[PDB]
Amino acid sequence: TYQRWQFTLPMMSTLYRLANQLLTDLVDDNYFYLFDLKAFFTSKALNMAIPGGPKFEPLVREFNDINKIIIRQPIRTEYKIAFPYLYNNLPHHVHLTWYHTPNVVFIKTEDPDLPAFYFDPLINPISHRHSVKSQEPLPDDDEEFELPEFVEPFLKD
Amino acid sequence: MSIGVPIKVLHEAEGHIVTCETNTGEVYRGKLIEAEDNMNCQMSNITVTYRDGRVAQLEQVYIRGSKIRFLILPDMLKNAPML
Amino acid sequence: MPVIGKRHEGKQLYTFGRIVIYIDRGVVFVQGEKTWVPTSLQSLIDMAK
Amino acid sequence: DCLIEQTHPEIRKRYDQDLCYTDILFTEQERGVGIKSTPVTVVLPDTKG
Amino acid sequence: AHPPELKKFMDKKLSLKLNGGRHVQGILRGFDPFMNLVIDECVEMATSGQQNNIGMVVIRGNSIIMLEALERV
Amino acid sequence: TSVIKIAVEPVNPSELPKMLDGLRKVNKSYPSLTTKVEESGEHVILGTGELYLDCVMHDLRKMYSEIDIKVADPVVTFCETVVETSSLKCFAETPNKKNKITMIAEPLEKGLAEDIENEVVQITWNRKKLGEFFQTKYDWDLLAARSIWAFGPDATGPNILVDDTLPSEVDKALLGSVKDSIVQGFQWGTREGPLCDELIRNVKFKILDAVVAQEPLHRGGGQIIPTARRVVYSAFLMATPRLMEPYYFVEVQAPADCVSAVYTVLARRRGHVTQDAPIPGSPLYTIKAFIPAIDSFGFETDLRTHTQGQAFSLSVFHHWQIVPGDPLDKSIVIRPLEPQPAPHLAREFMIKTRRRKGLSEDVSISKFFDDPMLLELAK
RNA sequence: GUUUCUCUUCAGAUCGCAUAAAUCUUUCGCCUUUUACUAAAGAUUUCCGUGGAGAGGAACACCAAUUUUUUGAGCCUUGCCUUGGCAAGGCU
Structure with missing residues (x-):
């Protein structure tokens, strides 16, 4: 019936790079900020377009004193997608967009010769080295502490 | 190691008020502070009953483990997740 | 004088002599026992002496 | 969440998705940004038990 | 650990x-895992309240x- | 401080009592929220920033009211300050003409205004301890430093009232009877301010004469208190008044190749950059910058779009800084739809705020100054 | 016990990390007319597939050294208690 599949990791690690021409190398979903499915819905529930997004037939078919308005910057259409209850009136059927995710920081090792854990040059060198060297409560040398015969680092073998 | 259920309930007893009677017959009644795995207790703020009747108050006391022959743990512990 | 640190409906409260008032673009409302009463300027004066 | 999961045996995370336990508002879950200070009371053991 | x-x-x-x-009655400075104490300025309180002075003493734990x-921690 | 200001009106005026019910309910929910109705009858909401107000407006509409509400554009609160010493000694005479008060206004010496908001010094302290603080840190004359009477507009407000009158020229006992009334008017005047009904900041006031009536009726209240307010306004207007805009502090994470794009977006919005450093043990770079809060609207959405979502920015409230331009420059013409040139900004902001407040377009100097002092201004 | 095939029942679920058509009510548009349409909303069904459970078939198959357990034991004298014993105290 061919319903369920279960593969080892050397198989998957090969199939991934055969497919590599089709796939896109985005590591995280931060790219689609106002370019995901939810953002377009806001652009359809309002009658107002995102610059690169798709277009639709619209769903439908003193206070306004301009002299009191400080037009410091234009209210660029993206802003009404991002905060649809503030920069906008009558937000009926509007969707809140997913705000952020932390930047996935993954460093692609180019060649397999290098050790898997190594300080890859793209990563900024840690400048820190204790200059004003602190004297935190480190116990004195030979102060009656010794381990039993057979304790070791857990996975040392 | 298998330090069983009673001594865990002793640790659970700390910070309350326990009564504690020694071989000689002195009865202590005091607020617990710490208790060790061999039942050495420290106790605070005690009202002690002597063997013959007399009361006295005390600042702080430390009671050797093997010298006890009951404690009266405070009843609410019967619910505790040791049991 | 303004009633420092106290406001009613976000409007700034002022004292007018012994009377507590707020102004709503010129209407004088005097603090009565449980309600604000719109008050003429003349009657404000003659209650504040 | 990891405290609650430790404390409440019937409650488990979904494999695909975080169990934002204190994010009780739809608004708060839709944004993915916590907006209300939500208190939790639990008893949980020390190393001593 | 084992020490008191x-x-x-x-x-x-x-x-x-x-x-x-x-x-x-004593000013204290010793302990080992058996609670063997080393007491200093150590007074002996006889039955009658006739008091002795004696110097630095060891005590067996089980005693x-x-x-x-007498004065707080 | 909840610096960002939006205004609301209900789409149907008959529904307005329902809206008020909504406003009271959100006020409980959000601690730093402030809801105020100004003399123009605008309903005003104050908020710490963009996403904060966005959630407030959601809850007002969907959770409590379920009515249609119009939302005005975001605006920032401004502050009023002086940059130079008063050109003329300004005096005011009370309406009964039996009392005469003279004051001058000067700036608080670049720093003291911050310290008072940090509660580093307090008027509950004894005058000796007060005197020692001002003399040691700021090199005040001890005679001046002992002669401190109040902070304004509140007990930790950024303005100080000083009595510089000599006991040989003004009876300190007679002055002491009217002392408390002066303080009250001083706090009041700093609260309102004469330019656009916004707070007075960083101003040191010295009294340099006081004529006081011997009869209690003529002193000590109704005469003194508005007159005290008026003289404070006259002194302020002659001391080259300026507006202060609020600046935000911004921190941005970005990969190295995106750094140049961050600079570009800030340059549009009058931003200034103050640090840019690699965070150790990561590829990302921190950038740090000041930006003016009125220019900040939409900045996050700009920065993330130009950098393909890689950058991200948080913003927080930080110092006031003096707005370029002169708010009293009658020569400037403000042309309604344009983003005005920078020298005009002080003129623009003053006018439009007053319009929003419903005040007269230009400050009738005659209103606060007595006729002899107007003759003095004419001379 | 693993696979298979068939039947029954419940489906809350990205029943599906995929995505079709039809009917009706309205707002539209080209429009002689009508299908066939357009493109938005709502109520609806049809179709390609799916999961859970159950039934039945078929095919291959260890320490006595103070902190508890290898004991500071045991013996007397006073008061009360009707007696019995209790409160002790003193010994080796």
């Missing part, structure tokens, strides 16, 4: 009440049935 948590009490002034109805502070 007696670390607090050190250099403060103790009374002890010893097996067999005996009493001694104690209480250990009380």
Whole structure:
């Protein structure tokens, strides 16, 4: 019936790079900020377009004193997608967009010769080295502490 | 190691008020502070009953483990997740 | 004088002599026992002496 | 969440998705940004038990 | 670990009440895992209240049935 | 401080009592929220920033009211300050003409205004301890430093009232009877301010004469208190008044190749950059910058779009800084739809705020100054 | 016990990390007319597939050294208690 599949990791690690021409190398979903499915819905529930997004037939078919308005910057259409209850009136059927995710920081090792854990040059060198060297409560040398015969680092073998 | 259920309930007893009677017959009644795995207790703020009747108050006391022959743990512990 | 640190409906409260008032673009409302009463300027004066 | 999961045996995370336990508002879950200070009371053991 | 948590009490002034109805009062500095104490400025409280002075003494652990502070931690 | 200001009106005036019910309910929910109705009858909401107000407006609409509400554009609160010493000694005479008060206004010496908001010094302290603080840190004359009477507009407000009158020229006992009334008017005047009904900041006031009536009726209240307010306004207007805009502090994470794009977006919005450093043990770079809060609207959405979502920015409230331009420059013409040139900004902001407040377009100097002092201004 | 095939029942679920058509009510548009349409909303069904459970078939198959357990034991004298014993105290 061919319903369920279960593969080892050397198989998957090969199939991934055969497919590599089709796939896109985005590591995280931060790219689609106002370019995901939810953002377009806001652009359809309002009658107002995102610059690169798709277009639709619209769903439908003193206070306004301009002299009191400080037009410091234009209210660029993206802003009404991002905060649809503030920069906008009558937000009926509007969707809140997913705000952020932390930047996935993954460093692609180019060649397999290098050790898997190594300080890859793209990563900024840690400048820190204790200059004003602190004297935190480190116990004195030979102060009656010794381990039993057979304790070791857990996975040392 | 298998330090069983009673001594865990002793640790659970700390910070309350326990009564504690020694071989000689002195009865202590005091607020617990710490208790060790061999039942050495420290106790605070005690009202002690002597063997013959007399009361006295005390600042702080430390009671050797093997010298006890009951404690009266405070009843609410019967619910505790040791049991 | 303004009633420092106290406001009613976000409007700034002022004292007018012994009377507590707020102004709503010129209407004088005097603090009565449980309600604000719109008050003429003349009657404000003659209650504040 | 990891405290609650430790404390409440019937409650488990979904494999695909975080169990934002204190994010009780739809608004708060839709944004993915916590907006209300939500208190939790639990008893949980020390190393001593 | 095995030692008593007696670390607090050190250099403060103790009374002890010893097996067999005996009493001694002390300024403390010793303990080992058996609770063997080393007491300093050690007074012996005889039955009649006739008091002796005696110098630095060891106590066997099992002889104690209480250990009380005459001036606080 | 909840610096960002939006205004609301209900789409149907008959529904307005329902809206008020909504406003009271959100006020409980959000601690730093402030809801105020100004003399123009605008309903005003104050908020710490963009996403904060966005959630407030959601809850007002969907959770409590379920009515249609119009939302005005975001605006920032401004502050009023002086940059130079008063050109003329300004005096005011009370309406009964039996009392005469003279004051001058000067700036608080670049720093003291911050310290008072940090509660580093307090008027509950004894005058000796007060005197020692001002003399040691700021090199005040001890005679001046002992002669401190109040902070304004509140007990930790950024303005100080000083009595510089000599006991040989003004009876300190007679002055002491009217002392408390002066303080009250001083706090009041700093609260309102004469330019656009916004707070007075960083101003040191010295009294340099006081004529006081011997009869209690003529002193000590109704005469003194508005007159005290008026003289404060006259002194302020002659001391080259300026507006202060609020600046935000911004921190941005970005990969190295995106750093140049961050600079570009800030340059549009009058931003200034103050640090840019690699965070150790990561590829990302921190950038740090000041930006003016009125220019900040939409900045996050700009920065993330130009950098393909890689950058991200948080913003927080930080110092006031003086707005370029002169708010009293009658020569400037403000042309309604344009983003005005920078020298005009002080003129623009003053006018439009007053319009929003419903005040007269230009400050009738005659209103606060007595006729002899107007003659003095004419001379 | 693993696979298979068939039947029954419940489906809350990205029943599906995929995505079709039809009917009706309205707002539209080209429009002689009508299908066939357009493109938005709502109520609806049809179709390609799916999961859970159950039934039945078929095919291959260890320490006595103070902190508890290898004991400071045991013996007397006073008061009360009707007696019995209790409160102790003193010994080796």
